[PDB]
Amino acid sequence: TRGRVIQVMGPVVDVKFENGHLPAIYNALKIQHKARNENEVDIDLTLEVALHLGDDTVRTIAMASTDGLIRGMEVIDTGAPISVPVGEVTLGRVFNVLGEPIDLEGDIPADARRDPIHRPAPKFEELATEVEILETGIKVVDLLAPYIKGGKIGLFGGAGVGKTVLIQELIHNIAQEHGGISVFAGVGERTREGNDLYHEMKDSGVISKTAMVFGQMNEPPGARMRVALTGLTMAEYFRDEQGQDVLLFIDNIFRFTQAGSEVSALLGRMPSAVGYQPTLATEMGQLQERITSTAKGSITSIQAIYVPADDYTDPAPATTFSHLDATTNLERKLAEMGIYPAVDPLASTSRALAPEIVGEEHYQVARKVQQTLQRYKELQDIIAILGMDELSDEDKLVVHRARRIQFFLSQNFHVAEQFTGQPGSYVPVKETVRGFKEILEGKYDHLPEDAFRLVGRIEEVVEKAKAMGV
Amino acid sequence: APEIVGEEHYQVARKVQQTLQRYKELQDIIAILGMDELSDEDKLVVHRARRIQFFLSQNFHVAEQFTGQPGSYVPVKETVRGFKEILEGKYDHLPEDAFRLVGRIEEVVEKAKAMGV
Amino acid sequence: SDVGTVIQVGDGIARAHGLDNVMSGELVEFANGVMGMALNLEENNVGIVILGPYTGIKEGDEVRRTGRIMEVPVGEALIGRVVNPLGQPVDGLGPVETTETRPIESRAPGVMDRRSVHEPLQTGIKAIDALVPIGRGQRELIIGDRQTGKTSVAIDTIINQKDQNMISIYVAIGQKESTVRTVVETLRKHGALDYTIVVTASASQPAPLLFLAPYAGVAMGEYFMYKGKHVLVVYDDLSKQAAAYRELSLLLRRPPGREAYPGDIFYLHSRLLERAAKLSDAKGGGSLTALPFVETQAGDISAYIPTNVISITDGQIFLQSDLFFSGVRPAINAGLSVSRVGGAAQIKAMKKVAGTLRLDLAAYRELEAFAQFGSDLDKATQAKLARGARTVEVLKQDLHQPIPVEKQVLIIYALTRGFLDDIPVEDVRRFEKEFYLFLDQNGQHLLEHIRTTKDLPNEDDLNKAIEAFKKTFVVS
Amino acid sequence: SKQAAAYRELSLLLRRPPGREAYPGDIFYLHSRLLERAAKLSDAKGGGSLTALPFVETQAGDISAYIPTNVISITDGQIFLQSDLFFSGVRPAINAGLSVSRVGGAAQIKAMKKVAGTL
Numbered sequence A: 001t002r003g004r005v006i007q008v009m010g011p012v013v014d015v016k017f018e019n020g021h022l023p024a025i026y027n028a029l030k031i032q033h034k035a036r037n038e039n040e041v042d043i044d045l046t047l048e049v050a051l052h053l054g055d056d057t058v059r060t061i062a063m064a065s066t067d068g069l070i071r072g073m074e075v076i077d078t079g080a081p082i083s084v085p086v087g088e089v090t091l092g093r094v095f096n097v098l099g100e101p102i103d104l105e106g107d108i109p110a111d112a113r114r115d116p117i118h119r120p121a122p123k124f125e126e127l128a129t130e131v132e133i134l135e136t137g138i139k140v141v142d143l144l145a146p147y148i149k150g151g152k153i154g155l156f157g158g159a160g161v162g163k164t165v166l167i168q169e170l171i172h173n174i175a176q177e178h179g180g181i182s183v184f185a186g187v188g189e190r191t192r193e194g195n196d197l198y199h200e201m202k203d204s205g206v207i208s209k210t211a212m213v214f215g216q217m218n219e220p221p222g223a224r225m226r227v228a229l230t231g232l233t234m235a236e237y238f239r240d241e242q243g244q245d246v247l248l249f250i251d252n253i254f255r256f257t258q259a260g261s262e263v264s265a266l267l268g269r270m271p272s273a274v275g276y277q278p279t280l281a282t283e284m285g286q287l288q289e290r291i292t293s294t295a296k297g298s299i300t301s302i303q304a305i306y307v308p309a310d311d312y313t314d315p316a317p318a319t320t321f322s323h324l325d326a327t328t329n330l331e332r333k334l335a336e337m338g339i340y341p342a343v344d345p346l347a348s349t350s351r352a353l354a355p356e357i358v359g360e361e362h363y364q365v366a367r368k369v370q371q372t373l374q375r376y377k378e379l380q381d382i383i384a385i386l387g388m389d390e391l392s393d394e395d396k397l398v399v400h401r402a403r404r405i406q407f408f409l410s411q412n413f414h415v416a417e418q419f420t421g422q423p424g425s426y427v428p429v430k431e432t433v434r435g436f437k438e439i440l441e442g443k444y445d446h447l448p449e450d451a452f453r454l455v456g457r458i459e460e461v462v463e464k465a466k467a468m469g470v
Numbered sequence B: 001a002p003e004i005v006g007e008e009h010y011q012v013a014r015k016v017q018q019t020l021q022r023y024k025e026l027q028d029i030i031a032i033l034g035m036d037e038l039s040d041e042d043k044l045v046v047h048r049a050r051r052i053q054f055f056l057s058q059n060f061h062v063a064e065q066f067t068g069q070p071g072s073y074v075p076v077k078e079t080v081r082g083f084k085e086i087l088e089g090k091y092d093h094l095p096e097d098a099f100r101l102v103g104r105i106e107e108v109v110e111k112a113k114a115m116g117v
Numbered sequence C: 001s002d003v004g005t006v007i008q009v010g011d012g013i014a015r016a017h018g019l020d021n022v023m024s025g026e027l028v029e030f031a032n033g034v035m036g037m038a039l040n041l042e043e044n045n046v047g048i049v050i051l052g053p054y055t056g057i058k059e060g061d062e063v064r065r066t067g068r069i070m071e072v073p074v075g076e077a078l079i080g081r082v083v084n085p086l087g088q089p090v091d092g093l094g095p096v097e098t099t100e101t102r103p104i105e106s107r108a109p110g111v112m113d114r115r116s117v118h119e120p121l122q123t124g125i126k127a128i129d130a131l132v133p134i135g136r137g138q139r140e141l142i143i144g145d146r147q148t149g150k151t152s153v154a155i156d157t158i159i160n161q162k163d164q165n166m167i168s169i170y171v172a173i174g175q176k177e178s179t180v181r182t183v184v185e186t187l188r189k190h191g192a193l194d195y196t197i198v199v200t201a202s203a204s205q206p207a208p209l210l211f212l213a214p215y216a217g218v219a220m221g222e223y224f225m226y227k228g229k230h231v232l233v234v235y236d237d238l239s240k241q242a243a244a245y246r247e248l249s250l251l252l253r254r255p256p257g258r259e260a261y262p263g264d265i266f267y268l269h270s271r272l273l274e275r276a277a278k279l280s281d282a283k284g285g286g287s288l289t290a291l292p293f294v295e296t297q298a299g300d301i302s303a304y305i306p307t308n309v310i311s312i313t314d315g316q317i318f319l320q321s322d323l324f325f326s327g328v329r330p331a332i333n334a335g336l337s338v339s340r341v342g343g344a345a346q347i348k349a350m351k352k353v354a355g356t357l358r359l360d361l362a363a364y365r366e367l368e369a370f371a372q373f374g375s376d377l378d379k380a381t382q383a384k385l386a387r388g389a390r391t392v393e394v395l396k397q398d399l400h401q402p403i404p405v406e407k408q409v410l411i412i413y414a415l416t417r418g419f420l421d422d423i424p425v426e427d428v429r430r431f432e433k434e435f436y437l438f439l440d441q442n443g444q445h446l447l448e449h450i451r452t453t454k455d456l457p458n459e460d461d462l463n464k465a466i467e468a469f470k471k472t473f474v475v476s
Numbered sequence D: 001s002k003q004a005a006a007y008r009e010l011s012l013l014l015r016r017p018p019g020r021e022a023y024p025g026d027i028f029y030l031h032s033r034l035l036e037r038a039a040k041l042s043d044a045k046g047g048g049s050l051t052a053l054p055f056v057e058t059q060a061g062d063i064s065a066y067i068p069t070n071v072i073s074i075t076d077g078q079i080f081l082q083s084d085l086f087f088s089g090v091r092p093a094i095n096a097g098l099s100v101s102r103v104g105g106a107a108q109i110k111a112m113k114k115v116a117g118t119l
């Protein structure tokens, strides 16, 4: 049908279309306009309905600047929520929120598959019992804080301490050993990361599969809100239609609440909490709940998430933090030591396998590791105050082994091959546990500490020590 | 007021309040500077303040259900006499815990006897 | 007429024109097939709150009225299923086939309809059963921060309530569906599903279902209570229900108060919690026990919702964050956890022995701080500290393996008498299970006597059997 | 403070727009109208005087609240009373440091000035 514009209110837009047969909530309306005379300005705009009003008026939100909108101009309604283009054809390019590629390498054909963004979460019927652990191929992650597939992961790491290297390695491993593809959706600052990912993941070829979606701070509130949901619809296509054993990734959750900070400005309604929208928990939940495992296909939408807010008691970080499953921390002081990845023994949950299923050895090893690290920390405190030489023999042996344990944590990443020159190593979780057990058992107390660096397996440590000409 | 309650009662009440206020500031002083930098008289003030705030606890009737103690009804004269006795420091030897949840000062003495003091 | 046209739609609220005869609180079902609750009448336009998905609603739709107040179907058929807050199946397995319906706005049992609690509820956790007993009909508040093991405690209780007649209704509000499915599978594995009902509303659902969920759960429990069946209701979290009602209230343009919640929070929580009571002998002896949950940020009790709920509860269970992180499972603080009705429901033997343990735990807790200050200590304090360490060791439960009460009283008596002094701290854990097995295979008569009499048996032969186990046990 | 509460209640019932703490816009106008009549008439008029000692209540000694600020900016001095000195054993509990009076030198007898300066 066709309806005319009657009101404009800037960012909230509040275009009150007068129409014959109204479109449902979340439906898409597209405006086409031409410069009939010198005064008028041609504009092509898309809007999303958000609220019905008295008589025929339907409130909307515009995804771009409304400068040049004139009362009386005709509007056409598409018939369905804003349709992202998705499928094989769309793989391998960077999109805006609406669906056009920002880089002008190519244009998506009209014939392609287009799916609506807003979909109800998977029913309770299709869910699956979740006990299994996803393998990351990173020794520390597989030893201290494993990730439950289908669950949200948190990584509290400052920019420049290895965030980009860590996520590149994760997506490379998940595309090398698994059938999983990744999806990235940023909202903040500058995307210099585009060229780093271009280098490594285009050498790997995964760039052709990862369908990045970008809309950043310069965009109006509506696009900054709906970008994450476009990113999620990218994964939803794979899980529903493809149904491959693709345990895919999506790399942003909290950024939706960072955009929700601006969604509070998008509302234009009664304030609540600390200026936040009333529907904060519901609005975040609608996104978070679409990430699930399922029996329709072997697709776990497990996501690694960075939280820029980093304030505990604030309502939005608390509401987001309630949904998180596992947590990890990246700190600069550990980066100083040359131990990479710079992850510390902080962990969360991940007990679905160990010790729940059997997991006895894994759980006991992890507990001993954390205990030894904290004992080494207090011993290091004592050493500075008075001196190590006065420590007893049995207490000194703890530091002796702790040095090796601390240094073994480093892993020679595959992505680092283009800078360091190391080919890179992938480790199975069982191999990590089995190999590390001997370290706690003191099989290799005599070996020099420097051998325990940037190696995948314990035999590699032994051979490196040998190569040092012992 | 001194006329309503009697001179000795009013004086005991006000000395108790003064000592408790002095301790209320001494705790902050201790937190910032430590518990070792206090003066001898300050040590005495804290020493008696602890016992005074402890003795104010009373075993109750209805609390016999919640915890299983008999309970006591303390006359005013016993209260003022006991508070004067502790204020003058006649019970320097007794431990602090003996002043916890008792009706009469004789029960304090009995509790200290049970402690083996 | 009984048919009216909707004229507004937004975020779960709709107005309608017409509907002259509609009653306040009535259920109205739209032409889409979804139904809503008529909160407010007006001179010309009724205000309707929409329970289901509102996207399909349009201006010009015709809404009809069912003719009844808000009702939740109930019946024994529901036992062993998973249902929405509104009584519609969300798990396949065909329809519900319920017997009858009960409104959600029932009047609570008034004064002189109740009796003092006299029947215990065995959670199977040594710490909860021993130091902070809970009785049937006592509403016990469970407060703790996230990642502290609260749901472990609730599931352990529901699992342990196997022999005792206890229709246990479990409700999760706003929780993640994956956790709900994991919990349902966990209950099925242990065979606790045949006597339990799970009703849940997740975060994805509209707020009206989230705020309706716990009332529907307690209305489910009410039917079983009236016939005389004992009932247990567990709420996964009340704070998120408060947030959902905050959403609904402020979307209705009602001024907020302290913090951000409207003034109706106390009414909302108290009306829900008041329906759980121990009915008197004249009424039939039915009992409803509630175990609500609330989330405290950074473990601070001083806040609007936590204190508001504490004013209603008959007790509190405080789960310590850092104690949980240290490795103690589950986490509970001796100082802040108290039960008012405790001691009138706990069996005689537990009061005979366990009563000494709580004072020892608290005194050890404070002496622990002093000893942390003190490098050098006298022998009596050392003995007290060692006993405290042993008590802390004995109080650590195994997950999903509740222990019967008789074993609890035996092990706690064995600890309190002090035979464990020779046994090293680490050896105590293995000692407990070996002692359990030795009692089970050989020492039957003591267990039978405690099961029937409810009192400690002859001490001489009891100590003889304990000493025989001490003979068989080998120190590391 | 109760006068301010009564005026706030009677204003809010009238639907007059609120202000800093729901107080109407006329609070300072009203208190200045009240307090400005206190004066010391000249010798010509007759030499009368109308001195005032208004009281203000404050929670937890937060004398920086709206009404205390208004009254302290209208008055010619304040006497700050604190429960801390009150239970400290010094009564009446007057804070000498925070108390100021802007008639300090003129409203005293000469011997009182002479001794009180050194005090």
Ligand SMILES: Nc1ncnc2c1ncn2[C@@H]1O[C@H](COP(=O)(O)OP(=O)(O)OP(=O)(O)O)[C@@H](O)[C@H]1O
Pocket: A349, A351, A352, C144, C145, C146, C147, C148, C149, C150, C151, C152, C153, C236, C329, C330, C397, C398, C399
């Ligand atoms: N007593 C325990 N012993 C061992 N592991 C435990 C224990 N309690 C909890 N856990 C582990 O920690 C996890 C914590 O899950 P849980 O749901 O209890 O967390 P919570 O944040 O305290 O509660 P909720 O999710 O209800 O708010 C459990 O899934 C389990 O793996």
Ligand SMILES: [Mg+2]
Pocket: C150, C151, C152
């Ligand atoms: Mg839980």
